[PDB]
Design a protein around this nucleic acid. Sequence first.
RNA 1: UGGUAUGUUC
RNA 2: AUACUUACCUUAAGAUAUCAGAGGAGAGUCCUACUGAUCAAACAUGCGCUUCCAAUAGUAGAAGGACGUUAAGCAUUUAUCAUUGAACUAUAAUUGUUCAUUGAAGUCAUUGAUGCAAACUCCUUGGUCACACACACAUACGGCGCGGAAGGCGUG
Lengths: 77, 73, 99, 93, 186, 195, 72, 107, 121, 192
Amino acid sequence: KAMVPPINCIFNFLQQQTPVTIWLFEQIGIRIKGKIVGFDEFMNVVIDEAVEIPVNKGTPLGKILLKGDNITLITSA
Amino acid sequence: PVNPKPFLKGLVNHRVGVKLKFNSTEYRGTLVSTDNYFNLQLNEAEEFVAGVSHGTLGEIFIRCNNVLYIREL
Amino acid sequence: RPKHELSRAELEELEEFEFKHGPMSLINDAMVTRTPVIISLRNNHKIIARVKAFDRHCNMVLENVKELWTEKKNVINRERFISKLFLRGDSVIVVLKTP
Amino acid sequence: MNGIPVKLLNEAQGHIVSLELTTGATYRGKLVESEDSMNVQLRDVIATEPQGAVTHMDQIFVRGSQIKFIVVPDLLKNAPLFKKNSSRPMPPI
Amino acid sequence: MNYNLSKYPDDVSRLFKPRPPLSYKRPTDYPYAKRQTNPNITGVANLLSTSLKHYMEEFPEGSPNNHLQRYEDIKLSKIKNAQLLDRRLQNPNVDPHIKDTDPYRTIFIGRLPYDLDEIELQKYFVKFGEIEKIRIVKDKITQKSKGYAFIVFKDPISSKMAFKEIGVHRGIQIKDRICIVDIERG
Amino acid sequence: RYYCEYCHSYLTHDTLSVRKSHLVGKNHLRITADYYRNKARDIINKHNHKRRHIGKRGRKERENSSQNETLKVTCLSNKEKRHIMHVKKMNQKELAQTSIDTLKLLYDGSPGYSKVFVDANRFDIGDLVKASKLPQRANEKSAHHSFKQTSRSRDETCESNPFPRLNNPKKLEPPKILSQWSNTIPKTSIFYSVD
Amino acid sequence: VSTPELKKYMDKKILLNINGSRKVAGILRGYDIFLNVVLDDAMEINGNNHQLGLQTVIRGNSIISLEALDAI
Amino acid sequence: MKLVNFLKKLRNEQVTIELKNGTTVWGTLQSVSPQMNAILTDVKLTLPQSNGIAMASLYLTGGQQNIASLQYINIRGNTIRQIILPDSLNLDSLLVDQKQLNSLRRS
Amino acid sequence: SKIQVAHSSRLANLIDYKLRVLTQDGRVYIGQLMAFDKHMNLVLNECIEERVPKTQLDKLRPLNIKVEKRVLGLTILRGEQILSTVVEDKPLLSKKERLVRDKKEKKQAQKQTKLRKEKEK
Amino acid sequence: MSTPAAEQRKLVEQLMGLHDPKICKSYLVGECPYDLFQGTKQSLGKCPQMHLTKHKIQYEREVKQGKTFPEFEREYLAILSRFVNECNGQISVALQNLKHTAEERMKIQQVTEELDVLDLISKRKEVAKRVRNITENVGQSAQQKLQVCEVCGAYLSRLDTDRRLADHFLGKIHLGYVKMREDYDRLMKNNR
RNA sequence: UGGUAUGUUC
RNA sequence: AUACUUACCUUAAGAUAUCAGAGGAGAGUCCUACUGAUCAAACAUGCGCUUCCAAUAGUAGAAGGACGUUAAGCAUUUAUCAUUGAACUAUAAUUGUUCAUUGAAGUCAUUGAUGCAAACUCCUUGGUCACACACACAUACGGCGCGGAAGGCGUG
């Protein structure tokens, strides 16, 4: 088709407002589910309606400015 | 639509919570100031080890090295 | 504002303005009022000491250091008094100031 | 600017080298095209995981920060990058 | 090892027969799945309760900072010098040496010589118009020529033409220096 | 800015597209290959001899060694040793460049000759052969050779060439012998060979 | 500074490895100067299977290497 | 306002350095890079009361015969956890910050 | 090891010394440095990488220690996963011989520049 | 930039009604001619109108389902027609230079001196003289041997093989100009 | 105001 | 080698050790083949300084190894899971025992891996140097030869 850079990929992912599964660091880290509302150049992603589930009973979290250095992987659930 | 810098300048003077990378240190207090490297300054913070509290701390400076996220209640 | 397009050789004035009116208000208050602060580090080395200098990397000079850690086997607390210390901002988890 | 080691890594392009990763996996293969950021691409790759097993990749591309070291062949022992007093023949204006 | 993609000929490739593959052994460190720092770091509230009472009892007073005090003394001296400069600069209508006529015909010549005389300055100023008054300004603490003078001519147009002719040609060559002329800027 | 240590040529601001194209052009290839050949030849040809350590030898070793015999030293003139060392250098380089190629020409009519020995339908390193063809952007490099390619495809089966003796094979090469020791060959053969 | 040479991986299936075991096999749709990898039809492979949505973007900090699963 | 220039004024100072691995290094400073790559001589280093990686790093440096006595050690910046200065040195005269004084005078 | 490493030397002066460089793992590399940079990326000639096994670590904890040595030859090691470097063994040729060699290299480089100036004319 | 973080910050600051003169309409539709000739030898300098990615994404989302704007398409058609007219004038100047090089004064004098001596046995002598004149004309044309590119207006060669020609066709100028010709032909097929 | 590489003719 | 076409690109800045004083230039800045002090580099130079430099009045030995042998040396430890069939101990996704059909990858290595220990052989290095095969020492050792290698301190 064409090339889709990651900044425009996250920008289209922001426009579509799909349900989001954001992963993090390993076994200490906890997988978060929410919806993206804002990001920046250091990949500090702002998410809303966050429910956290540990690695294989979720708890609501609200609105979160997740920092960049722990973000590993972003999927559309 | 929004960016982390206007959301974080508007996050000043609110009971916010910050989780660290270690899953045993969570500081919940009132945000005072934040720079462009996103260092955090809180007041009357409370320690949360795995959910349970230990005591009040007060004016505290949380380094952006060990933060994981900041939340708004 | 972008960092590379501000100015030349005037970034130190903006760094001092961020030092006076930013997140550095606690490291500035501790070095002018000589109050002891408690720095928790990334390897359980809690330091009670007074701040002597400030750095952009949070490299801090500490005087009359009383440091304490806990060995968990069973549970013992081992402390040490060190006169002068130059602490790197890599190790610093958090800095607490007492009133 | 760049420096001598990244020029040496860009020097041995198209040669059998052996990488070791930070996890412990050792790669070995022919270097396709090295870069200044050391994000290097290898071909006919034989891989050894830290568990111990041996496998074979066709076309690998590893990032420069996850590299322990890389072994260049021995004929690059004598290189003009190693010369200390090599003068410069009239750089252009 | 036998056939290559390499652009080099076979005589180069026989010189580029590489090293034998590395003898793998078992690793020593923890794998990157287990590479992390220490968990369960306790809070610092226990040090502020018990350890702070013993820490303040051993050192009730801190050491003075001589470098911070010297920097504060330098900042206070700079502030006092700026205040003295503002008081000296803030404190043309209350000057008896500037009690001449209006500044439309009164030009000012600066950076003149220290050993000049009023007769040569009057002869230089009366060449492009009739001069009504001339006054060389000096310091109040010492009787030294600072190189400044004010010449009020009879007409404003002749004084402006004299100032333009004296300041256009890189300053008027007054006998040991180049003194330019301009408006009084009162 | 960029400077090639090999070609001794400068460049503009360091662009990866220009630096990549510089290591492909033929002048850089010639200078780099000649430099590597000369540095390898220098580190082979450098006879780093050991520094000699002569001690005051024992007495009985001197009465034993100076009475046994005195050997004869052989020595040659300048052109003789020059010609002999030049022949030894060409022999060393022709032994370093050669290799035994009997298995390639001995299994030439094998049914899997087009899958292993053809070196282009090989599985692991055949993509490396098919990738860099040296695509001959000069017309003279493509118009110079006028012979056949004889590219054996992988799809050649056992139905083609059923009898390997009717399709004319080659007689195998004799075992080559050393030319300096060729005068001790048995001049009389065992059987009568014609032609 | 320099854009990485992932042009040969334009329409081919690749397999990223994440930190010792997380093998995400996808189709590379785009990259940056940070080795952030955009994958269409991602798939987690464990030594079992797990699907990872339609599109995904993966941080270059956790990316170590990548195997070109498809021929070039 | 980097305090590596404070350590550049600390030549021939007999200090200790605790590293992030856990090793205490007693030795005199010779020079320090602005990236805080500090060289030391007349060194003895000790791993206190464990970390087997730190014990391997302690023994595999030559000169063990667990106090290891070494002649010259360069230490990278990111491996430095903290450095302890001798108490006899006056910190009020070495932290004068003449570059900061020139920057304040230039303002 | 009675080498007496120089008391006021840096990486420009420690060149062509048989280093014994330590890493974060403890995988000690022994070899001659020939280049460095700002990130301290060290090329190593005739290098050997030595480790200790996990079974030998119990004996090392408070004698003979059987280290595992692998041969790398000419490698190029990064400055991220290294911890410390020392000088283990002195090189073959001395300081005066390196000075005469550097003067011969300078004279050869000046002769090469004269040859380039002659070929340019 | 020397750091990639400032490059990513620049990408964020340039990535984050609509009918305004600040938006480049040739880039809003797509393939602006000031973008396809940025750093080459045929560069036009710098585009005075601003280029944006969010406006391009909004225009793509509008042209996907919502609607289309004919004014920006007409402006892009006018810009493509002006650039195609300038390139056709450059190609006509190159063809006139080739015709002047083929009709030089000394070359025509040598050709007339060869044809003046060109005049069964007489027919065979005339055929040999015509073959010699054709060989002289081929030797005169082989001194340059530069053809004219039918699309991009550059110079080509007939004796050159297809690999160097394929290296010639994969450039920024040729890909951009073939894309502009495809857009111009599509707009002329839609308008007529 | 230029550099690198490549293809033709003398 | 000249002449021409084509493909890519056309540049992050500022500065060259520090402190004090005097003079000059229209509180701030610049300069002095200006003066004192510290530091750095280079070249010489000396400190009864610090460490090392291998028999030959024998057939040896010091340092570093063998990616060398005895050596398959001696002592230990492992070499896949699930469904079902004929019995079955049985809290498991019948785990345990004997046999098999099938299903996914499936390191080679068991002459393997770890620990222990001796002997033999071979590689790189040297001042393999000048006199002599000699009676010194509590202030423990006449360091008062020609050098070389590494380093410390001091002077120009």
